[PDB]
Amino acid sequence: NATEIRASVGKMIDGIGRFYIQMCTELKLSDYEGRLIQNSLTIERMVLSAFDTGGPIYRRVDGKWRRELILYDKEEIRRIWRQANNGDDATAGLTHMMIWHSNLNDATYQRTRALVRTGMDPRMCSLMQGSTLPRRSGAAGAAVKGVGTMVMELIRMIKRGINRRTRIAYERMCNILKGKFQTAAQRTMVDQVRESRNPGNAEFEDLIFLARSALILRGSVAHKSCLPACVYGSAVASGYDFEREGYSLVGIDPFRLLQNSQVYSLIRPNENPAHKSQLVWMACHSAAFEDLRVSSFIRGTKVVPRGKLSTRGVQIASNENMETMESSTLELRSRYWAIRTRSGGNTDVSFQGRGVFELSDEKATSPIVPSFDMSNEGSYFF
Amino acid sequence: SSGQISIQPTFSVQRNLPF
């Protein structure tokens, strides 16, 4: 059923587009200045804040880049937003940029300070997918969460308590948790945890176990290809009418869109452009914990590890100066594409028979199997 | 250490999953 699912999500994409365009028209930005992932970000956050303000806005004058610090009527923003979505709320839409931010953060940063202070092993990176993602996120917002993500929550919810309505949360938070697991025991053991009203160290210690079980017997976690507002704004402006032509977040749609995107980014004096593009690209598909081998395979070019990556973050801090600042064009194109999955595999070869698709292969017709016998460069982005 | 130990899979392909 390609009617609701493909076209209803198109309608949520149209909203973000339309809105971004309107909002650019207010700031009186240029074309080059609307394609600046920097400005796009600021706008996206202005909105999520207002639906739950001001921000950094970079301008282009003869030669150099000027940063403007601006503020907007928190309600005006909310007004312009609905205008774009037909006076609807389109929580989906806000939630979408809620993820784009997530997926960018799960790749720009490593959240160790928090894992340990919770009592999780820092080496449990690959399980913290969406730890940044506000609880306000929707139902299809939590499905993107890693097993480890859930644990850090319950453990804190439990840790402060064990140190009214709060109960329905805990059980559900576990049901979700449990719905991540895809094996008998895994599934059953989650229940044995959900049994205690005041679950103390008994649970505290047990879930941590299950956290580690997922390192081997992974769960089902959905991945959503969520592109920056500018990319959708630009697309909408170019005529693409997604609600009518359909769109996906786990199909070929997102890759294809990024095959024509003209996104620019601010880049510090000593940073490596190629390295910058890599980052953004990995946030566009939630590939921050993917096997570097495969990421590079599909990417088309080396996908260098975080340590060897030359960049500190895409957003520009108030500390820095503009004099020594310039901007590059982000390389977001990829070689092939792949069905962003949810499954963690089980039996060691996973996704037996599943392959990669050419960017011409619109339909999921002919699959391609990668052979990794090769001089690779690692598997752990972190 | 302080590094990764397993790989979270993002795509559907024939891939030995590292841990």
Side-chain angles (χ1 to χ4, degrees):
Chain A
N1 196 188
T3 65
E4 309 153 285
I5 314 164
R6 217 194 190 278
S8 69
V9 71
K11 191 182 71 188
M12 80 104 95
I13 235 60
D14 297 355
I16 295 166
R18 293 209 229 82
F19 167 73
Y20 196 66
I21 292 169
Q22 189 50 57
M23 195 66 84
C24 288
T25 299
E26 310 285 58
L27 287 297
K28 349 229 152 171
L29 313 170
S30 61
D31 194 72
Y32 193 91
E33 288 182 300
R35 305 184 174 278
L36 197 70
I37 190 158
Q38 320 297 173
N39 294 320
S40 176
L41 290 161
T42 290
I43 296 172
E44 309 157 331
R45 63 194 327 197
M46 282 170 102
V47 177
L48 287 176
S49 72
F51 268 75
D52 183 50
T53 187
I57 292 290
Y58 317 75
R59 213 85 183 197
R60 197 203 195 167
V61 186
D62 276 305
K64 300 181 185 152
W65 286 83
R66 315 282 172 193
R67 198 195 335 196
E68 291 184 286
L69 241 178
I70 56 157
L71 305 91
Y72 244 54
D73 244 306
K74 307 198 188 287
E75 79 189 328
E76 175 77 313
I77 280 64
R78 300 172 294 193
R79 181 238 112 179
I80 300 195
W81 170 261
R82 298 167 176 315
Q83 276 295 58
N85 303 289
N86 263 66
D88 269 300
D89 301 288
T91 307
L94 291 173
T95 291
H96 197 65
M97 318 201 269
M98 194 81 91
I99 299 182
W100 138 243
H101 282 170
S102 180
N103 277 329
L104 188 42
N105 221 72
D106 294 27
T108 300
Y109 299 131
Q110 198 183 339
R111 281 277 168 186
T112 301
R113 191 197 318 186
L115 304 192
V116 293
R117 197 239 191 182
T118 303
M120 324 189 78
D121 208 36
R123 291 172 290 168
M124 295 174 123
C125 285
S126 69
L127 303 197
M128 235 45 56
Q129 176 180 355
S131 86
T132 298
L133 183 46
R135 67 320 142 176
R136 205 219 70 74
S137 166
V144 73
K145 273 156 201 292
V147 175
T149 312
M150 293 277 80
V151 182
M152 205 204 118
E153 313 181 306
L154 292 174
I155 297 312
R156 184 70 175 300
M157 181 188 84
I158 282 168
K159 169 149 156 178
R160 268 304 184 285
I162 314 287
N163 211 171
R164 320 252 186 180
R165 307 157 102 200
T166 49
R167 176 59 175 183
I168 296 175
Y170 169 83
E171 320 192 4
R172 197 189 65 183
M173 293 165 86
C174 311
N175 280 66
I176 290 171
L177 193 279
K178 181 194 152 184
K180 299 293 191 183
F181 308 91
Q182 262 289 68
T183 45
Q186 285 269 30
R187 308 154 193 157
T188 287
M189 211 181 79
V190 183
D191 271 301
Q192 303 182 13
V193 180
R194 186 216 308 180
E195 210 57 319
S196 162
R197 174 271 135 177
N198 203 63
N201 283 54
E203 270 76 29
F204 176 129
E205 202 275 290
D206 192 271
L207 288 183
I208 293 194
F209 164 75
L210 216 43
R212 297 193 179 187
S213 63
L215 290 190
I216 299 279
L217 306 172
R218 344 258 190 202
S220 310
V221 174
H223 297 301
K224 300 303 180 156
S225 290
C226 302
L227 314 184
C230 62
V231 172
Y232 300 152
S234 184
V236 175
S238 303
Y240 286 109
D241 209 283
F242 298 93
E243 177 186 52
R244 222 154 310 176
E245 326 177 355
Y247 190 55
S248 48
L249 292 52
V250 313
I252 194 192
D253 289 308
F255 283 35
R256 266 192 173 164
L257 196 59
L258 280 185
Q259 287 301 293
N260 294 70
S261 43
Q262 198 45 17
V263 190
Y264 314 108
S265 182
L266 298 174
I267 177 165
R268 293 183 284 281
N270 286 162
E271 318 195 293
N272 186 173
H275 270 52
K276 182 71 61 158
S277 296
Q278 179 189 305
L279 185 61
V280 182
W281 181 89
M282 305 171 84
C284 300
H285 323 108
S286 313
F289 301 121
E290 233 280 50
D291 181 323
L292 289 173
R293 294 191 289 171
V294 63
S295 305
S296 308
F297 175 67
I298 301 177
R299 209 279 180 91
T301 52
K302 318 182 183 174
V303 178
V304 167
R306 180 74 184 76
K308 294 286 191 284
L309 218 55
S310 294
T311 171
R312 301 198 204 199
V314 175
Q315 305 196 31
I316 289 79
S318 50
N319 297 184
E320 303 187 46
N321 64 294
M322 286 315 86
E323 161 60 55
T324 47
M325 181 73 97
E326 58 290 63
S327 55
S328 58
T329 307
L330 284 174
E331 166 66 345
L332 300 172
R333 291 174 313 178
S334 39
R335 215 306 182 177
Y336 304 88
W337 68 280
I339 305 282
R340 274 73 69 182
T341 337
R342 324 172 289 169
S343 185
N346 166 73
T347 316
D348 280 320
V349 273
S350 303
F351 306 85
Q352 159 69 223
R354 296 325 191 287
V356 292
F357 311 80
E358 301 286 336
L359 290 172
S360 57
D361 200 331
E362 191 181 21
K363 311 166 178 68
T365 301
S366 57
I368 290 194
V369 189
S371 186
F372 288 72
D373 177 328
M374 197 33 67
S375 283
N376 51 157
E377 23 225 321
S379 285
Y380 300 179
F381 188 50
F382 280 123
Chain B
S1 63
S2 311
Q4 270 204 57
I5 285 300
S6 168
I7 267 158
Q8 189 83 286
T10 302
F11 315 108
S12 173
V13 177
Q14 257 198 52
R15 51 147 144 182
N16 71 78
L17 302 174
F19 54 77

